């Protein structure tokens, strides 16, 4: 080895060794992630070094939680991480397609064929596949039913049946709640809270906010019916002067005067709040809730509670925007210009206590543009799994709304796309037809893995589905209960079009780049 003659402490793989190493790593990753695909996939238990337990079947989460130190695994993991970051779904399919592409490419490379021809065939097949996907997408008006179908198609793969149905209802309702016509959807306005006191099916959607902190003064009211919401970012605690003031007195009376007069600055803002509260509501019928992003010292808390005002302190920064959109007021950084129109309105505010932590509920808003999903479960791992599932569902629904087209699932699109690629193969000049065939066979992995996870046999189910598609022309997928060919569109198994496009692009690019690597070096020491 030339490299080892310079740096003796180096690890090098060259020529066929690099391809063998990369393909072996990809095949191992695919072998591990085969069991995740589909609603019939198997759960995994992931125990960290500290002993924490996770129960997930996500491709990205599983990839993060394996104990793997391989370079090709790192590359595939980064590709899947980008997949999850942008589209939010299709990581297991990403890994499976990359692995099958590499396997099919090696099936020809091992017989003396240069990888460049395979990459050219991959490029041609990718172009044709993108054209076919454009031809096959189903443009639709994203009503509630289609969104529910998409949410089921994701959550059934992420959790079990009835929990999936509950999560579908909650996710679709929340997305439709925060969605503005002809305006991009901001997923930051859906706050995800976790409480750990009830069953997993108790997860629901609250048309308001749930804050993990409550009023710190015992005398403050625990339940306010009609509330005026004041969202502020003003410090109501003692603040030191920036220029190192210090006090100088000559008697105890002077010290008492200086003690009493050092609170005047904060007392002025507290008095402004109290004056606004008195002006807005002259009786005890209505309530006043002050939600502050900064701290409130006990003196200000007592002064506010003497007037029947509920005050929250150290609220999250995003809660300013969330309460502004839900309650409808305005976030204030100063009280100099305080007006009644600056107050949001909430139809119910109450505090819920669970163990050592207290939660505040702000419900019955007029038309909340920001809502919250309250994840409930008896275990921490259940809460984490439900959070991941609802993230996947929210991404899926947002993607479906973003473009009015959705793609049939259950492997139908891959089968039809492979058939189209096979038909188009003769048009490709040269030996790139081998690469086109490899790409089609790699695309056919999804129905194969679905049949495996459902417990059927790959060959019989695949030939049945392919024969049905060729004979009828419909987009027929895999029936995970009977194994027979089945139309995905009619039953309501939908896949995100953007997810499939990203899958094709990323898988083709990463496979082409890996296949062209002929040397692996570790000589930075």
């Amino acid at each position: 080895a030339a490299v080892k003659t310079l740096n003796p402490k180096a690890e090098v793989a060259r020529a066929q060794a690099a391809l063998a190493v990369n393909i072996s790593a990809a095949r191992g990753l695919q072998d591990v992630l085969r069991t995740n695909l589909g609603p019939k996939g198997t759960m995994k238990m992931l125990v960290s070094g500290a002993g924490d337990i996770k129960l997930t079947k996500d491709g990205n989460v599983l990839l993060h939680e394996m104990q793997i130190q391989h370079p090709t695994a790192s590359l595939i993991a980064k590709v899947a991480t980008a997949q999850d970051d942008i589209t939010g779904d299709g990581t297991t399919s990403n890994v499976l397609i990359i692995g099958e592409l590499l396997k099919q490419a090696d099936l020809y490379i091992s017989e003396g064929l240069h990888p460049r021809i395979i990459t050219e065939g991959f490029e041609a097949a990718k172009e044709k596949a993108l054209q076919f996907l454009e031809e096959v997408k189903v443009s639709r008006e994203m009503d509630r039913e289609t969104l529910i179908d998409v949410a089921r198609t994701s959550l059934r793969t992420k959790v079990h049946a009835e929990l999936a149905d509950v999560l579908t209802e909650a996710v679709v309702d929340s997305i439709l709640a925060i969605k503005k016509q002809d305006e991009p959807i901001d997923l930051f306005m859906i706050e995800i809270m976790e409480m750990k006191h009830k069953s997993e099916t108790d997860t629901s959607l609250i048309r308001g906010l749930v804050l993990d902190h409550g009023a710190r003064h015992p005398d403050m009211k625990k339940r306010v019916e009609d509330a005026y919401i004041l969202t502020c970012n003003v410090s109501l605690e003692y603040e030191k002067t920036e220029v190192n003031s210090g006090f100088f007195y000559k008697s105890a009376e002077e010290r008492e005067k200086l003690v009493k007069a050092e609170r005047k600055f904060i007392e002025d803002r507290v008095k402004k709040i109290i004056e606004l509260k008195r002006k807005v509501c002259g009786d005890s019928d209505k309530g006043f809730v002050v939600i502050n992003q900064k701290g409130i010292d006990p003196f200000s808390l007592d002064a506010l509670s003497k007037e029947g005002i509920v005050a929250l302190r150290r609220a999250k920064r995003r809660n300013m925007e969330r309460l502004t959109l839900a309650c409808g007021g305005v976030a204030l950084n100063s009280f100099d210009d305080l007006s009644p129109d600056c107050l949001g309105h909430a139809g119910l505010v109450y505090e819920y206590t669970l163990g050592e932590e207290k939660f505040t509920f702000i419900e019955k808003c007029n038309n909340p543009r920001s809502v919250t999903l309250l994840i409930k479960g008896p275990n921490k791992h259940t809460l984490t799994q439900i959070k991941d599932a609802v993230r996947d569902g929210l991404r899926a629904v947002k993607n479906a709304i973003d473009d009015g087209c959705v793609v049939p699932g259950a492997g139908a699109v891959e089968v039809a796309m492979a058939e189209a690629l096979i038909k188009h193969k003769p048009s490709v000049k040269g030996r790139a037809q081998l690469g086109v065939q490899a790409f089609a066979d790699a695309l056919l992995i999804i129905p194969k893995v679905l049949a495996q996870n459902s417990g059927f046999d790959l060959q019989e189910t695949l030939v049945k589905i392919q024969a049905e598609h060729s004979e009828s022309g419909q987009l027929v997928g895999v029936d995970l209960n009977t194994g027979e060919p089945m139309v995905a569109a009619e039953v309501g198994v939908w896949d995100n079009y953007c997810v499939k496009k990203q899958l094709l692009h990323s898988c083709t690019v990463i496979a082409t780049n890996i296949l062209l690597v002929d040397e692996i070096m570790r000589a930075g020491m």
């Binding site: 030339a2 991009p184 603040e239 002067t241 920036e242 003031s245 009493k260 100063s334 496009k501 000589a523």
Partner: protein, 526 residues
């Protein structure tokens, strides 16, 4: 006891003679052999592992050479010349390494034949002068106004990279970025793509969606949610001074003895912030950009005037914004002027890409800085795309500064080798043999291209030499993908003259430097 007495300290090794020369030449040859196979349109990529856990999948020679560690000092010299070639012209980093390795390889033959290295060095210098002369003689002019030819040049520069699939888009991006970055002031032409052509990579999406913006794009969000995230024609005001209340430089201390002094001082802090914001507002801006923090009270006073503020932007990003929107960064807003207000930005949008907020100052009219937004499969893919785009922009700048072109695909190598060989017939001294040796050592580029293509080296190279023995055949090279001899007037693969000149100069001078060396000494401290 009685420790031994030495002249030089312990562990001070010394090697001398023919062994040192052979070791240096073999080290250079090994360094060349490391990246020999990464040349041409048929090059295969390499997968490097960083000591910190990173992975560098690249085809660029300079990146590969800078990501490895060596102990032989000749290898260090080779790495240094690769870095020099990368920094000077932008590409040619593996061609120069291969050429230097071949020159040292052919110099070893004379060093083993009782020839002093000084004679070889003199012959090499004469040969380098004649190569410069021939390269300038066989060049062709280019008019920079023709955008099609510029795109073709950039394409011929990037056909050897992983971006050749989207070569057209890449060429358009590089050309537009270089054209916008180009700037002149006080009679000083300036093309500074290092600072004013920023490449931002966001993983995801598709690479076909990557584009160059008529503005800038920074990973920032509004300080306050009430602030507008969409403004049509913003009047941008740039700052590099914090909008908060800060302690003075002097040792200042207060002494409070009256009741109302504490609250008074706090009120003066608030009033100072208010006056600062009023001074900013007097110019009637739309967005305010600061390099330092912005206090919450300042945010309130700015939103009172319907002004969007971005809190903490980097120095380089602020400079790019100043170039793009025509603003001028100021520190004391009481000294703010109308000329410092940045008008020219055609839109300001703050939209969420993935799970992050990004600020767009796009749609500028005549911007002098740009952001290349790259979207792709992952971080390694985007890093390689960024390196290829850097090569493309460097080549575009080299062509813009120096508008001559020379044929590629080894045609220039063969033409210069033939001219050098023909001129060598006039010499009668002993220096002619190393002269011809380096002349034919220049033939390594077409040989490497043929080897990488997978064709037969001996007969193809012999036929190419025979073709170049004719009169009007100096533009005849080799196809890098089909392994056949073609006229580069038809293939269209041309290279900037500056790149070739720098490559030849660096190769010959590295050969000279490593030939001058003997008596290696090592082990001493600092």
């Amino acid at each position: 006891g009685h420790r031994p007495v030495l002249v030089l300290s312990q562990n001070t090794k010394r090697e001398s003679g023919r062994k040192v020369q052979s070791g240096n030449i073999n080290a250079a040859k090994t360094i060349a052999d490391i990246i020999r196979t990464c040349l041409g349109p048929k090059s295969m990529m390499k997968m490097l592992l960083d000591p910190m856990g990173g992975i560098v999948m690249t085809n660029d020679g300079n990146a590969i050479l800078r990501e490895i560690q060596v102990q032989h000092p000749a290898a260090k010299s080779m790495i240094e010349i690769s870095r020099t070639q990368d920094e000077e012209v932008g590409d040619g980093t593996t061609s120069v390494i291969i050429l230097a390795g071949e020159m040292l390889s052919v110099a070893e033959h004379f060093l083993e034949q009782q020839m002093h290295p000084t004679v070889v060095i003199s012959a090499y210098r004469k040969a380098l002068d004649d190569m410069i002369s021939t390269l300038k003689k066989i060049s062709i002019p280019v008019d920079i106004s023709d955008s099609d030819m510029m795109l073709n040049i950039i394409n011929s520069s990037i056909t050897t990279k992983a971006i050749s699939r989207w070569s057209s888009l890449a060429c358009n991006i590089a050309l537009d970025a270089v054209k916008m970055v180009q700037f002149e002031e006080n009679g000083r032409k300036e093309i500074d793509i290092k600072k004013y052509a920023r490449v931002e990579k966001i993983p995801g999406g598709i690479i076909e969606d990557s584009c160059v913006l008529r503005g800038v794009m920074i990973n920032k969000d509004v300080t306050h949610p009430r602030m507008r995230r969409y403004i049509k024609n913003p009047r941008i005001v740039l700052l590099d001074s914090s909008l908060e209340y800060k302690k003075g430089e002097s040792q200042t201390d207060i002494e409070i003895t009256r009741e109302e002094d504490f609250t008074r001082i706090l009120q003066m802090e608030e009033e100072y912030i208010q006056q600062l914001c009023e001074d900013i507002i007097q110019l009637k801006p739309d967005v305010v950009i600061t390099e330092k923090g912005i206090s919450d009270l300042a945010q309130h006073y700015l939103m009172r005037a319907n002004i969007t503020a971005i809190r903490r932007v980097r120095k380089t990003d602020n400079n790019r914004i100043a170039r793009a929107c025509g603003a001028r960064i100021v520190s004391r807003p009481e000294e703010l002027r109308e000329d410092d207000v940045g008008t020219g930005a055609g839109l300001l949008e703050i939209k969420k890409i993935g799970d992050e907020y990004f600020t767009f100052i796009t749609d500028c009219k005549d911007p002098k800085a740009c952001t290349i937004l790259l979207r792709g499969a992952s971080k390694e893919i985007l890093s390689e795309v960024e390196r290829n785009l850097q090569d493309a922009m460097q080549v575009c700048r080299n062509v813009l500064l120096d508008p001559q072109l020379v044929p590629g695909g080894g045609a220039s190598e063969m033409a210069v080798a033939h001219a050098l060989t023909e001129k060598s017939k006039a010499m009668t001294g002993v220096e002619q043999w190393p002269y011809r040796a380096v002349a034919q050592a220049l033939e390594v580029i077409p040989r490497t291209l043929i080897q990488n293509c997978g064709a037969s080296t001996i007969r193809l190279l012999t036929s190419l030499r025979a073709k170049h023995t004719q009169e009007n055949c100096e533009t005849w090279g080799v196809n890098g993908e089909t392994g056949t001899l073609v006229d580069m007037k038809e293939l269209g693969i041309w290279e900037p003259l500056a790149v070739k000149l720098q490559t030849y100069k660096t190769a010959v001078e590295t050969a000279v430097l490593l030939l001058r060396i003997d008596d290696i000494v090592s082990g001493h401290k600092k």
